[PDB]
Amino acid sequence: FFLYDIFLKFCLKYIDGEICHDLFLLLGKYNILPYDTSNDSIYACTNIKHLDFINPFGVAAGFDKNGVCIDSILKLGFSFIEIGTITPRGQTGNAKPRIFRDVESRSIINSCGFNNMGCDKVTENLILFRKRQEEDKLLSKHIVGVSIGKNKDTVNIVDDLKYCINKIGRYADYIAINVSSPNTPGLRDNQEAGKLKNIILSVKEEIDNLEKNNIMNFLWFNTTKKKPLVFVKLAPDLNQEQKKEIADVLLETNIDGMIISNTTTQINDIKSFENKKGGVSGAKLKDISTKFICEMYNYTNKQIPIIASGGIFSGLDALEKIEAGASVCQLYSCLVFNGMKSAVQIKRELNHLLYQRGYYNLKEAIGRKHS
Numbered sequence: 001f002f003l004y005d006i007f008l009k010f011c012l013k014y015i016d017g018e019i020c021h022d023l024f025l026l027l028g029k030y031n032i033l034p035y036d037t038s039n040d041s042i043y044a045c046t047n048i049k050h051l052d053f054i055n056p057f058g059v060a061a062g063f064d065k066n067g068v069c070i071d072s073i074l075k076l077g078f079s080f081i082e083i084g085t086i087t088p089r090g091q092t093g094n095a096k097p098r099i100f101r102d103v104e105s106r107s108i109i110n111s112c113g114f115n116n117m118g119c120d121k122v123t124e125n126l127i128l129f130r131k132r133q134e135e136d137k138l139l140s141k142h143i144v145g146v147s148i149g150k151n152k153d154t155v156n157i158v159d160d161l162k163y164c165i166n167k168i169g170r171y172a173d174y175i176a177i178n179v180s181s182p183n184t185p186g187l188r189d190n191q192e193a194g195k196l197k198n199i200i201l202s203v204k205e206e207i208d209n210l211e212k213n214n215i216m217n218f219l220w221f222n223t224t225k226k227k228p229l230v231f232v233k234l235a236p237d238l239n240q241e242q243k244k245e246i247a248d249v250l251l252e253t254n255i256d257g258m259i260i261s262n263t264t265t266q267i268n269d270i271k272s273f274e275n276k277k278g279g280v281s282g283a284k285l286k287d288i289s290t291k292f293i294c295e296m297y298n299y300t301n302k303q304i305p306i307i308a309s310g311g312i313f314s315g316l317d318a319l320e321k322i323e324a325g326a327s328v329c330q331l332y333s334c335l336v337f338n339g340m341k342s343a344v345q346i347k348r349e350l351n352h353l354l355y356q357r358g359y360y361n362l363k364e365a366i367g368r369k370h371s
């Protein structure tokens with residue numbers, strides 16, 4: 001458990017972004033990635049309704065787009081993973097190279113364009129994992145969510161989301177509505193109050209309709225054994241009117257949680273990304289995101305639980321997001337810049353910090369900045 005850091009520093013030096021991405025998914029495919037069977041702190045526990053996370057750290061969407069590494073990635077010490085984003089039909093995505101990193105600022109820029117094997121192939125992989133999960137006592141508590149979007153040419157999102165829910169809904173602990181991507185035009189236009197309310201109610205109605213089509217209680221082949229929760233992933237690039245307008249919709253529609261936030265197209269302060277096009281992740285996104293959690297946690301009057309992402313690399317970064325209003329933390333660029341150690345390390349720092357600040361448990365620290 002050092003060999004990986006020689007590999008990582010070398011990878012970050014001479015190897016392309018997507019080659020590392022396809023290399024990491026290769027190691028976990030043949031299950032040759034390290035384990036973390038070490039028991040997690042009971043004071044570091046968190047939840048979103050019936051969704052009970054062993055620790056507050058999971059993997060963001062876009063890491064395991066196709067769910068070919070679910071068990072492998074979880075075993076690194078994460079409580080959950082968000083597979084996808086997935087679309088009804090598979091897509092090659094946008095032109096390569098399309099993933100670039102600036103080590104100096106710990107940032108990433110990407111124009112992937114929902115590259116996936118399609119909803120049907122990803123479902124095939126999730127059913128495989130859920131089958132492994134039954135036999136296994138270790139992955140019995142690990143949560144697996146699915147991020148759903150639309151094919152580039154889909155003239156109406158709703159139809160594309162109605163298809164994915166009917167296919168993969170049965171095997172997800174939660175569904176994440178992806179209306180925040182900056183690399184598939186113009187998905188962000190769906191963040192308008194009217195459009196978003198129709199999306200959220202259509203999705204929730206489809207989930208309800210799965211049950212209303214059989215006597216099987218057997219029906220839920222997930223971790224919770226309950227209907228998936230419905231979450232919405234939001235872009236940080238919004239004005240205050242747009243944010244308040246959304247808040248009022250999330251309250252009326254009774255959305256289960258909100259993933260604040262996706263990548264940002266506001267950053268122009270990176271030299272290595274000047275020519276490049278896409279959304280910016282990592283450390284340069286941290287300050288924006290924490291400010292956006294505050295705004296939304298105040299706008300939804302603390303009623304809608306939050307999943308934070310990103311710019312999370314340390315235990316302080318984690319506690320910052322939690323004190324702002326978030327219940328869980330998703331990681332992405334941390335896994336790119338710290339590698340395999342990521343979970344094990346971030347989990348140590350947070351327990352060390354939770355004690356240092358004067359907390360009995362994580363829950364007690366949630367939204368602490370608001371007072």
Ligand SMILES: Cc1cc2nc3c(=O)[nH]c(=O)nc-3n(C[C@H](O)[C@H](O)[C@H](O)COP(=O)(O)O)c2cc1C
Pocket residue numbers: 060061062063065084085099108110112114147178233261262263281282283285286309310311312330331332333334
């Ligand atoms: C290469 C790449 C691909 C991504 N693909 C997706 C995706 O399919 N779905 C999604 O919801 N977010 C996607 N994201 C955004 C992440 O889920 C995450 O919200 C973002 O990277 C911010 O987290 P971080 O600063 O901790 O990295 C992607 C990010 C990167 C770097």
Ligand SMILES: CCOc1cccc(=O)c2c(C)n(Cc3ccc(Cl)cc3)c(C)c12
Pocket residue numbers: 007008011012016017018020021022023024025062063064099101335336337339340
């Ligand atoms: C599965 C997603 O993979 C990634 C995505 C983006 C950029 C990269 O270049 C990535 C890098 C450097 N890494 C870290 C990594 C990659 C490969 C190895 Cl062998 C060890 C660590 C991941 C997981 C990366």
Ligand SMILES: O=C(O)c1cc(=O)[nH]c(=O)[nH]1
Pocket residue numbers: 062085110111112113114115178180181182183184262263279
């Ligand atoms: O695959 C992509 O294009 C993608 C999706 C998303 O939500 N965010 C991102 O930065 N890239």
